[PDB]
Amino acid sequence: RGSHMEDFVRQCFNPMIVELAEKAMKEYGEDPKIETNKFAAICTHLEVCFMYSDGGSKHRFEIIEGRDRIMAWTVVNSICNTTGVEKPKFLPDLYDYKENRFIEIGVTRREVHIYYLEKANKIEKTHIHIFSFTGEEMATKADYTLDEESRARIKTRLFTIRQEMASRSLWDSFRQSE
Ligand SMILES: O=C(NC1Cc2ccccc2C1)c1nc([C@@H]2CCCN2C(=O)c2c(Cl)cncc2Cl)[nH]c(=O)c1O
Ligand SMILES: [Mn+2]
Ligand SMILES: [Mn+2]
Secondary structure, three states: OOOHHHHHHHHHOOHHHHHHHHHHHHHOOOOOOOOHHHHHHHHHHHHHHHHHHOOOOOOOEEEOOOOOHHHHHHHHHHHHHHHOOOOOOOOOOEEEOOOOEEEEEEEEOOOHHHHHHHHHHOOOOOEEEEEEOOOOEEEHHHOOOOOHHHHHHHHHHHHHHHHHHHHOOOHHHHHOOO
16 A cells, blocks of 8 residues: 555645545546546546636636536436437536537647547547647547637646656656556
């Protein structure tokens, strides 16, 4: 037990993120103490989802990620039976009330292009928005949903996470884990 990566995750992300991520890993049968790199990834993805939903107007995004699996499905059925939008096969991350699309957020260490395709195969009418620790983004139909500055905030934070990891020599292990 007790890795540097796990102690870094707990000091780097805020407590609400850390425990939402722990709960999700355990819910899906994984242990944050052993799979510490994936622990970092989930918290990162989580924080991006929250920053993303703060990017729009006050009540534009519905957050699906972070909820327990059963409640997350309850709200998207509500969203579907209220929007006449088709029920996705897999849980997405947000719902955009303004543009009436579900959103799948992606946070890749690998190459932006390859990640989007891989995420596209899982499919096929929900919007996809990928961010990288390098500062590159790709979005379905070249529609990036939020304005430049809200997206720029997310990329700034991703690169800060990279640096803090690299400053502790954890970046190498994290990069080659995905
Ligand atoms: O909803 C998702 N997972 C649910 C299912 C699941 C499983 C374990 C823990 C939480 C959740 C919740 C979801 N999963 C992924 C990837 C690919 C499938 C597994 N996985 C991760 O464990 C993950 C990665 Cl590698 C990086 N960041 C966040 C996460 Cl959760 N990527 C997303 O973008 C995304 O939304
Ligand atoms: Mn998700
Ligand atoms: Mn996602």
